[PDB]
Amino acid sequence: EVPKEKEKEKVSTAVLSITAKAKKKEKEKEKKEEKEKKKEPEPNFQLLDNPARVM
Amino acid sequence: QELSEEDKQLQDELEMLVERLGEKDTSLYRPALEELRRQIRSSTTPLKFLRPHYGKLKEIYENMAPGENKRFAADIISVLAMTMSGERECLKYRLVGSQEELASWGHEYVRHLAGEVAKEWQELDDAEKVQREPLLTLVKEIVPYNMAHNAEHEACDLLMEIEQVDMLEKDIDENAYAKVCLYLTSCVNYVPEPENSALLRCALGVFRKFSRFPEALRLALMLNDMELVEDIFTSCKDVVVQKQMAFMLGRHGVFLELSEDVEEYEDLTEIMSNVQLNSNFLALARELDIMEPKVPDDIYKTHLSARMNLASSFVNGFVNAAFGQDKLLTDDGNKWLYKNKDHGMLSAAASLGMILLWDVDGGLTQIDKYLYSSEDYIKSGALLACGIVNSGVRNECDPALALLSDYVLHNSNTMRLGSIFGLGLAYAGSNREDVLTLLLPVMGDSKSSMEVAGVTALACGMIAVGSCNGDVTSTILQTIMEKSETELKDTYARWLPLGLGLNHLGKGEAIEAILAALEVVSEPFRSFANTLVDVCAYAGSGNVLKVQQLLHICSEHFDADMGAHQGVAVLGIALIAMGEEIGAEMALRTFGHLLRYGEPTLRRAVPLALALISVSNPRLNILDTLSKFSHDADPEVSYNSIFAMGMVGSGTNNARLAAMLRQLAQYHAKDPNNLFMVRLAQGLTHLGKGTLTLCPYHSDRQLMSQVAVAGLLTVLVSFLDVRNIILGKSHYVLYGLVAAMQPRMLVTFDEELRPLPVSVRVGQAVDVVGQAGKPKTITGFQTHTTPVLLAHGERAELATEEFLPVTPILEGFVILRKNPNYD
Amino acid sequence: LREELQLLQEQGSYVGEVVRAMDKKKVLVKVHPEGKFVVDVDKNIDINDV
Amino acid sequence: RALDEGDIALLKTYGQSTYSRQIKQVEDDIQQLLKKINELTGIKESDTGLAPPALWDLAADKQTLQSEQPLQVARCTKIINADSEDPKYIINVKQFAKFVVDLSDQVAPTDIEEGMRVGVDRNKYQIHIPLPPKIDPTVTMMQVEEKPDVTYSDVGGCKEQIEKLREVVETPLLHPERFVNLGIEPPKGVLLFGPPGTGKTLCARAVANRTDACFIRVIGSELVQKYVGEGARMVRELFEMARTKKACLIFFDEIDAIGGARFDDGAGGDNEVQRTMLELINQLDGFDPRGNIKVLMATNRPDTLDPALMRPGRLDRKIEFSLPDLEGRTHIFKIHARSMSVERDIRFELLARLCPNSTGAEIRSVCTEAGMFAIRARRKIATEKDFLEAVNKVIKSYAKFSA
Amino acid sequence: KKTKGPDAASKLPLVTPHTQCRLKLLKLERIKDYLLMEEEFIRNQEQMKPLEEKQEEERSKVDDLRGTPMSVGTLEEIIDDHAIVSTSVGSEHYVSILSFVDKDLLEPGCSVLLNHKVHAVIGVLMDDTDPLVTVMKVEKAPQETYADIGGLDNQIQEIKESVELPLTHPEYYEEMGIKPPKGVILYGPPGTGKTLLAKAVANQTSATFLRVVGSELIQKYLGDGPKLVRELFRVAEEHAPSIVFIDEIDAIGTKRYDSNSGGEREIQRTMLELLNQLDGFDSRGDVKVIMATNRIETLDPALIRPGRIDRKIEFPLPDEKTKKRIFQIHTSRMTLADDVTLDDLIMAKDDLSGADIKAICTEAGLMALRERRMKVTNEDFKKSKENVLYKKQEGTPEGL
Ligand SMILES: Nc1ncnc2c1ncn2[C@@H]1O[C@H](COP(=O)(O)OP(=O)(O)OP(=O)(O)O)[C@@H](O)[C@H]1O
Ligand SMILES: Nc1ncnc2c1ncn2[C@@H]1O[C@H](COP(=O)(O)OP(=O)(O)O)[C@@H](O)[C@H]1O
């Protein structure tokens, strides 16, 4: 009922050598500038009205 | 395999020696190593034999008792690790080693040691500054060895790796300093900004030390530090260096405002003001016999209409520019403008001013009569002609400021536009406080139209180019904010970011504040403006990061149509790395792939960047590609290709290119929209009779002149969307070529400042030997008298060692003095 | 096998010497009786599988 | 003393730069990216017609798809051989077939002629489209030449030759008198021969002075070719083109291989030459005399084959010159100095005397050299540039005689 | 069938040091970064597509009509609506093509497709890749430049003027009304002649270049050596106007033999055709023919005449400075020594040409690499002279 869909068409930049040396300088700057409800309780303890499809 | 007999015998002897050294008792350890090391350090002034003994030698070195034995063991392990190196074991063993005189262990060893030292100097963390001093001492020991044994360029490599150019300065002597400085300058083009400014500063230090102030001024201009330029001009004192400095500032176009306390200040400020520029240029044109006014008709080759006649007038003005000798608009000029129709009288008068540019005295008198013309267009064109006339050339009394008094803020849109563009062209590079404080209030006017405000911004940017004028920027941003966005983002607000980029040209870094301030703007215009100002600020830097950002942003669909900024990204692609040949050729190839598989806007913009790469340089591949893409389906693409051919052939008189444009004119005779601009391209090709080139890279084609590149970029911003704007009204924007229009011949003076007839050898100057930082080698000595047109690829050289120039750089103006050995 | 015989009644398959693998699932091939026969690509083999 | 293995690797690791290996790896990466982007091409499709025909001509392709059932009569095209009295056509077909068909109802038998190529519809092989190919190879585009050769002052007028040939070429093209006053047809032929020089320039002048039925410069050395029958077909199509272009004159040039020498080595040294000779005679025999078309053959030596005695009936009026005297040489100087930026105040008669019998070709060459000397001096002026004119002409005469 | 080739290679030959240093390394880093950025840009442009529009209108209309089965056949002729094409096994179809019809790329004599069934043209293979009958433009516009050869300044200026009379300043002798395709007749010792090629690369910096060396004494009955070179310089006029370098053949193929008749036909055919093509009155074109040789004596009188074939240029032996320059050029790639032993190897030398200079430079490296492997082998100082003797200059009994 829910696709959880994403259309990115995004490819990472391949900066390698001097762009990456500048990226090292960028690192130099950038250095400073649900378990209790899932273990036991499966929904099997419900009550149903008289009209109820059950095998 | 059967080795040599004596080789095998010596191998067995060394095997016995290493077994002796690997024996149990250490009382024979010392004699064994004494024997061994002597022949170990023999071939370097052997190493093959000890190839399989890596582990045994490591064990022996570790087991050696501390002291002499241990440090010789470390010495031998180091000198062998150059072969048995899985790591910098050589340097670890040598740091453990003696640290005595190393240079005797062979050139290969010392060079490997220098390389490993550079590796460790880069590798060591910030907190580690203990061994850094021993590595620096080793470096200061090896540098003299390199200087003696002609290894100064790799010495510079290692010193720049370790950031010790400061002591490079102190160690280098002048006997080899020239090639070292040339190597530094070559590295400057590709090193990023911090170390780039560092190497520029160290080169200035070297030249100041060695009294090499003329080239030091070239380097300071590269540094674009006017404060340092003034400091070094004060530092130099001799009359010859003073006057060559004044020539260099005048040729660059930026006026240096100083005091009269200096000697011969009148001549210095005159030659900086380019007062004699026009006189010398006309004298050399006459000496070349290249003075006759070339008719646009016989340029057109008419052997086989209002806009077409306008284009003919414009190309006539381009051809006769800087000359002031054209009766076609002088005698019957009033008749021609009266016959002209609609909006073109302004452009015709501006073309007359183009003819009279750099001619202050004659141009002002011959435009005074047209100043009182009846038509508003003719009056505005006359005012713009005055601005063009005073553009570039500086004047003591500065007549343009007084001449444009009522028209500067005149209510009439066309008159105000003419005056504003004229003042921009005049004060371009002047950075004059009075002109700024008079034009920025005109920027603040609300009655002026959107395009009028854009022209005010253009004038302010070309005046304060590369100045980071904070009040100009604040006025720009305030005007943008006050103007509503809907009417802002239509077709003409593209001049405000241009002004911002001019004002922050060549600075970078600080552009973050400007873009953060501009972030409030809506996307369709903000995404264009921030990109424009960023690329203009980072022009001439080779920032692969910035250009790949531009590529990524133009890779988007962007399909109200905000995708226009893909065009400014395309222009910035060329603009960032246009400096040297690399970064321009490959960038051409990138433009080729853009045209190969690109959007309509992308292919509309590409020819603009193609022209920006190689303006006034007729590269055969560029010409062929532009010709092949001149017939594309998109009319704007065809227009941009036509103008790109015109620009790349501008100031060249390239005969085959002119023939190609004539064929294009025949092809496009049916459609006047392409026809008149093909005529325009031919006029660009023959502009100034080819005497003045348009490439903004001067001083041996490696200096970015801010005013010239500003005018050129304004023209290219207009040609981003001429398909609307040149068709509509912008017949005046084409007159920005005054800034980029500089003569490309040699004018020789003497110590008494008189024109010398000294002949020089001119021809292709390209590298032959790259063994070191050798000066560029010229071939093809087609020597003749001093007036010689200097094009790309080819340079000039003095015929004999008889006239010493003030600077080895041979272009524009130069003073030649008699050599003491001249006989 | 009978269906294989019926397929061989249409010669079954044709031997082709592949030369040019175009991007649009296209291979020129060469067939000894005639020669080049530009054709599409099969489903079991991609364009790059050629 | 080889001593290479291991030692070579050790010495290769011995020196180097500090980062020579780094540079090697980086340039390897450069080449790798180069090959990757050469594989990562732009328009990665060999077939073209991407959109300008594949957007509106593709819409018209929908119409041609709706009419795909017609326009399929291509199949194969073969020439026809002959026919019966009228209805049946007995044809040799490029499938070697003894092919006879009822010509397609849309095609009348009049249009189809023997030896013409027609396409046949595979279903019935009816004569559907009789294509008149008229296809010319590139060398034939050279055999045919330009019509408007432009008139001159009789191209350095040698009055004798031009005035002898005008009654033989110009007069018949005028057709003023050939019919009655003089015998039936004008002189049957004209052979404008002579040593390398004035030959065919007078022909070009006559072409200019005459109507649009203008000549073609065909070469016998190009006529003689490999294999058999190709020269015959080439001569045939030569006559066909000349006949079609307003019955223009056919200018055979350099007839010493088309006719060969006076001998064949053993009747097998050049028998293709004889095959060409037979068909050329069959073509230019005229059969029914016709003052419409003209033919001129020009060699430098009368090396024609045995038809040299039949041609008095066919190709008469052999004329020559190529012997410029003082007056002819100075007139050639005048017509050439009409070109360039020269004038005649130069005493060019002096140089005309200086060179005895220097053709018109060498006079044109001397004028070219004068212009070259002017541009070498960088002076475009040549009207008063007469002393320099004389100097360059005399020094180049010296060089031509002895260099 | 051939017009141009895609020149998207030769990435910036200007690596300034051409030796391993920081500057050269940084230049290579910028080059590889440019390659990375261009690949990334094109890939992002092609992947992050501007728009998704159906089957790009390809599979909808043209691809299906083209169909799956096809066959390759040459295109023969052209008609206003239909096209007349000669497909395989001598088939001929006159069919109009409207799907993927690119008329400019179609051309007669080119490979087109046939969709079988209802045989009609549906596409063309512009690649084809079989124009191999006579191939002489494969080496066109050689990359060699002026700087490759030095010390020949007079000859360089002369040839540059002789070939820049066109291109540059064509209106000069256009107004002079001569348009002279004079070509250049080059002398020179037999020890050179590829030096003549080197001085031709100066012109080869502009437009293309064709070469006919030795050819033959055209025994061929059709002759057509010079006539086919005429067709090929017509092709060069179609291309950028190329030069034709016929070094040696201008000497043997055009030999001033005193024999008149009964002599290889070339004398009949070849010289006459050479003159016919060298006279500007017959063939136009900025094509400049460079007839180089090493035997000035065998200059035929027709070739002798500057009237048709002007611009005679003599290549002399290198001087002392020229020898210095050429040795510097040839040893610059190899870092001969640190002592720079330059003038000792040439001061007493006489009659040494460019080929010998290249040979001795190569053999010095060979002999060092043999066993004296020492990088800048200190032995190089005298071993350059050692392999400079190398005997092999000349040997003929004693006779003296
Ligand atoms: N009488 C003349 N007047 C002017 N130019 C002449 C004359 N005769 C020959 N020439 C020149 O000679 C050259 C070739 O002339 P022409 O066309 O007559 O000969 P061709 O076809 O080359 O052959 P051939 O020289 O064997 O007759 C041209 O440059 C032409 O100007
Ligand atoms: N002066 C020179 N400068 C640089 N290179 C030269 C020079 N002379 C010859 N060469 C090079 O050496 C090669 C051989 O030239 P050359 O001596 O003419 O050979 P050959 O004698 O076989 O004709 C040429 O290809 C050229 O590149």
Side-chain angles (χ1 to χ4, degrees), chain B residues 19-36:
Chain B
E19 294 293 328
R20 152 81 72 91
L21 183 63
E23 213 182 38
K24 295 188 175 301
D25 62 326
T26 178
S27 295
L28 302 183
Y29 273 21
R30 186 269 187 189
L33 188 153
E34 302 279 325
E35 297 143 8
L36 170 72

Side-chain angles (χ1 to χ4, degrees), chain E residues 61-81:
Chain E
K61 293 179 179 179
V62 51
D63 178 65
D64 45 60
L65 292 193
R66 287 181 55 257
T68 288
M70 260 92 72
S71 188
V72 185
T74 62
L75 197 104
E76 183 178 2
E77 183 178 2
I78 288 304
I79 186 167
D80 287 358
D81 289 345

Side-chain angles (χ1 to χ4, degrees), chain B residues 182-202:
Chain B
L182 181 49
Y183 190 97
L184 292 153
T185 50
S186 308
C187 298
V188 164
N189 296 115
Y190 320 93
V191 289
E193 72 284 21
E195 57 174 358
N196 194 312
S197 179
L199 315 173
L200 290 181
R201 295 235 56 179
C202 74

Side-chain angles (χ1 to χ4, degrees), chain C residues 22-24 26, chain D residues 43-48, chain E residues 58 100 126:
Chain C
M22 271 282 92
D23 74 326
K24 284 295 145 293
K26 159 187 166 188
Chain D
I43 169 62
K44 183 178 179 180
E45 181 56 278
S46 60
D47 314 327
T48 299
Chain E
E58 180 193 17
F100 242 63
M126 70 172 186

Side-chain angles (χ1 to χ4, degrees), chain B residues 4-53 55-60 62-92 94-120 122-176 178-188:
Chain B
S4 182
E5 303 81 5
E6 296 184 6
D7 186 74
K8 287 181 69 66
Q9 211 291 318
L10 267 54
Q11 167 190 335
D12 307 335
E13 183 178 1
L14 297 194
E15 287 280 346
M16 295 298 102
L17 263 62
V18 303
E19 294 293 328
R20 152 81 72 91
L21 183 63
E23 213 182 38
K24 295 188 175 301
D25 62 326
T26 178
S27 295
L28 302 183
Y29 273 21
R30 186 269 187 189
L33 188 153
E34 302 279 325
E35 297 143 8
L36 170 72
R37 76 178 87 97
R38 165 200 47 180
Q39 57 254 14
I40 301 299
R41 189 269 299 164
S42 177
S43 64
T44 64
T45 54
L47 283 73
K48 171 189 180 181
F49 293 156
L50 293 86
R51 184 66 245 179
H53 299 171
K56 182 172 181 298
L57 286 170
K58 291 154 47 186
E59 190 277 331
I60 291 179
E62 189 65 282
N63 189 359
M64 274 303 194
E68 299 283 354
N69 286 270
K70 193 167 184 178
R71 59 89 174 174
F72 292 106
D75 171 70
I76 298 313
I77 294 310
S78 59
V79 307
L80 277 177
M82 65 179 288
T83 67
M84 55 173 59
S85 169
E87 182 65 26
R88 292 188 296 272
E89 298 186 9
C90 172
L91 188 153
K92 74 172 281 193
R94 179 65 65 193
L95 188 153
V96 176
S98 57
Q99 263 65 37
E100 61 86 20
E101 190 276 331
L102 277 296
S104 57
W105 263 259
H107 182 74
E108 302 83 322
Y109 171 66
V110 65
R111 184 179 66 189
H112 294 88
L113 179 60
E116 290 172 290
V117 164
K119 301 160 191 176
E120 293 293 328
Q122 198 77 5
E123 272 291 339
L124 289 182
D125 216 1
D126 52 332
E128 182 65 26
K129 299 294 187 291
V130 185
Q131 303 150 10
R132 300 267 198 165
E133 303 161 8
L135 282 71
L136 292 175
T137 57
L138 186 49
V139 167
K140 300 166 187 312
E141 288 155 341
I142 64 188
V143 175
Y145 192 95
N146 298 19
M147 293 177 70
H149 313 81
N150 64 7
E152 69 275 16
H153 56 291
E154 51 276 60
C156 182
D157 303 342
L158 61 83
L159 287 161
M160 163 175 48
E161 205 56 272
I162 70 181
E163 285 68 37
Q164 184 62 256
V165 296
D166 291 331
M167 288 305 174
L168 182 62
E169 293 179 353
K170 317 303 163 63
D171 291 331
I172 301 299
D173 60 64
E174 190 276 331
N175 303 85
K179 50 184 64 182
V180 182
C181 297
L182 181 49
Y183 190 97
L184 292 153
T185 50
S186 308
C187 298
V188 164

Side-chain angles (χ1 to χ4, degrees), chain D residues 155-156 195-201 217 332 336 360-361 364, chain E residues 279 308:
Chain D
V155 60
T198 67
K200 105 105 193 60
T201 15
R217 175 179 166 85
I332 296 174
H336 287 341
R364 175 70 278 272
Chain E
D279 184 1
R308 297 294 181 192

Side-chain angles (χ1 to χ4, degrees), chain E residues 144 146-152 189-199 201 247-248 294 315 318 322-323 325-327 329-330 353-359:
Chain E
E144 311 293 69
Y146 295 71
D148 289 345
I149 162 255
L152 204 66
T192 49
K194 300 296 184 183
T195 316
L196 303 175
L197 156 71
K199 78 170 65 171
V201 323
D247 70 86
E248 301 177 1
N294 297 316
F315 173 87
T322 307
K323 284 179 184 177
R325 168 58 51 172
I326 184 187
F327 231 152
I329 294 176
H330 268 148
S353 68
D356 289 345
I357 291 301
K358 196 172 56 171

